[PDB]
Amino acid sequence: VYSEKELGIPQLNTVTPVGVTKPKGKKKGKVFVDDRESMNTILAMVEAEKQGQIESKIMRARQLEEIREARRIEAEKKEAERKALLEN
Amino acid sequence: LEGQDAHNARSDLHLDLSFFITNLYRSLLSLSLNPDLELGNNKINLQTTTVLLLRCLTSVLLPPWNIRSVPPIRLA
Amino acid sequence: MRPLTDQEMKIVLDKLANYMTDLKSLIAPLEDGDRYVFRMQKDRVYYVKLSIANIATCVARDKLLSLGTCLGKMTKSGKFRLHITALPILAQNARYKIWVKDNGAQPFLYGSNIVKAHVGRWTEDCPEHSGCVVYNMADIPLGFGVTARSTAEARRLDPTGIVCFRQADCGEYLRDE
RNA sequence: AAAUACCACUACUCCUAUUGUUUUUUUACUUAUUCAAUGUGAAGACAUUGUCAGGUGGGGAGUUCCUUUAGUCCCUCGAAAUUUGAGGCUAGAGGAGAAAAGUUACCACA
């Protein structure tokens, strides 16, 4: 068993998009996660992946909804940052 | 959650009271400063907010089970 | 000194959630409108107030050595590790807890896995490979580690039998002396 | 260390008064300033904001300084007085680039 990171395996385009791939052996732009909203969404993902299977449908719905709300709040936070830096 | 069956269901069913505990802790002050406290075999349908808060605090501070497991920080 | 990236906090929070229950409180704002953040100097991770981090940014990179509480180190393979320095947060917000007698705490202080013969108190309903903080009967936090068996198997286990695998003990303070 | 009689000087510490200057703290008020509205009200001399000197900068854009050694007892700064320490000069030695790279008589597994 060997890692696909070790092997020079190209990325394949599936239902999950490849996106703008980054060149090998080059500077990939480090994106720093420092907004409390961004830690909110990451922590929500971690807690969901840890808790796992909840029997109650409404509980599943609520954990998924808090994930979506964290993503949303991050989205308006980034949009506000963009507007601030674009006009002011 | 103090029903025996739900008591045993607890962890397997992922039943947590933390939100209610925090709500009680954050609402004690309004319950202190509101006027209608004493304008009033049943376990829920009690007409007085004073006895309602008494049941709340008995449940939290002295739950009928695992009396020697209550978090000291919550206690204090 | 840099803030963590997305994958790095994914890994760090995975470890902290494997041994802890609440982390929104960890990242919760304080009364004075300040919050705890995560930073990486060299290869070690650190839990510290934002104000302290912003006041410590003047120190040259090569001239910084500590900041807040060291929660562990990222490894050359990109895998996080916890430390005896990261213990107190785990003590504050632990998921599972195991208490050992003096005659096992002294072994655990020398770096030995706990066994049924030395355990004296348990948390009911504990999975086999769970996250347990090791205390004594005087509730001083002594370490953290992974349980060897579940609770029932621990009960029916031979008393000369490992119940919790050591992963970090207080003796490292006698190493870095 | 310094020796007292004699008479000459300026050196600070602690108080007083008026024949005066500034700097800082607290309090009070609107004229500095901030917010709301259109075809005047409130806050308040604090914030906010601007200009230089700096510290850091693993983020963004562009291109391919200190330490040691030996010397003239040649210059500057700090200290102490009957000498030192830190720099300065001469020329040897150290420190494609945030992607990751190199290494170990060590550890675990295979």
Mutate to test the interface with C, among A3, A43, A50, A69 (most CBs of C within 10 A): A43
Chain D, protein-covered positions (CB within 7 A)? 54-60, 97-100
User: What residue type is assigned to position C34 of the chain?
Assistant: D
CA distance A37 to C51: 18
Q: How was this structure determined?
A: cryo-EM
Residue A76 to residue C17: CA distance in whole angstroms: 27
Q: Are the beta carbons of A51 and B13 separated by less than 8 Å?
A: no
Q: Which residue has the tokens 């385009």?
A: A13
C57 torsion bin: left (phi>0), alpha (psi -120 to 50), beta (else): alpha
Contacts of C3 in chain A (CB under 8 A): 32-34
Nucleotide minimizing C1' to CA distance for residue C44:
D58
Q: Is the CB of A50 under 7 A from strand D?
A: no
Closest nucleotide C1' to the C-alpha of C64: D56
Best of A22, A46, A78 to substitute, by most chain C Cβ atoms within 10 angstroms, is: A46
Number of residues assigned to chain C: 177
Distance from CA of B12 to the nearest CA of A (A): 9
Out of C5, C17, C35, closest to residue A33 by CB: C5
Interface of B with A (CB under 8 A): 13-14
The helix-helix angle for A36-51 and C6-19 (nearest 10°) equals 50
Of A30, A36, A47, the CB nearest to C5: A30
Q: Strand C162-169's sheet: what is its strand order?
A: C114-115, C162-169, C141-147, C131-136, C96-100, C119-121
Residue of C122, B40, B76, C8 lying closest to A42 (CA atoms) = C8
Q: CB distance B13–A55 less than 8 Å?
A: yes
* CB C140, CB C170: distance < 8 Å: no
Which of the 8 DSSP states describes residue B68? Answer: G
Instruction: State, as a whole number of angstroms, the distance between the CA of A65 and the C1' of D7.
Output: 101
Q: How many CB atoms lie within 10 A of CB A81?
A: 11
**C39, closest nucleotide (Cα–C1'):** D58
C-alpha C139/C-alpha A84 separation (Å) is 51
Burial environment of residue C114 by CB neighbours within 10 A (0 to 12, 13 to 18, 19 or more): buried
CB spacing of A32 vs C2 below 8 angstroms: yes
For B34-62, the DSSP string reads -SGGG----SS--S-HHHHHHHHHHHHHS
Q: Can you read off the two tokens belonging to residue C3?
A: 């803030």
Provide DSSP, C38-106: EEEETTEEEEEEHHHHHHTTTS-GGG----SEEEEEE-TTS-EEE-TTTHHHHHHTBSEEEEE-HHHHH
State how far the Cα of A68 lies from the Cα of A71, in Å rounded to an integer.
5
- In a mutagenesis test of the C interface, which of A42, A49, A78 is the best target, namely the one with the most C β-carbons within 10 Å? A42
Please check whether residue C135 is in contact with residue C100, taking contact to mean a CB–CB distance below 8 angstroms. Answer: yes
- Any idea which nucleotide's C1' is nearest the CA of C60? D56
Q: From the Cβ of C54, is strand D under 7 Å away?
A: no
Nearest-Cα residue of chain A relative to residue C22: A47
Chain A neighbors (3+ CB pairs < 8 Å): B, C
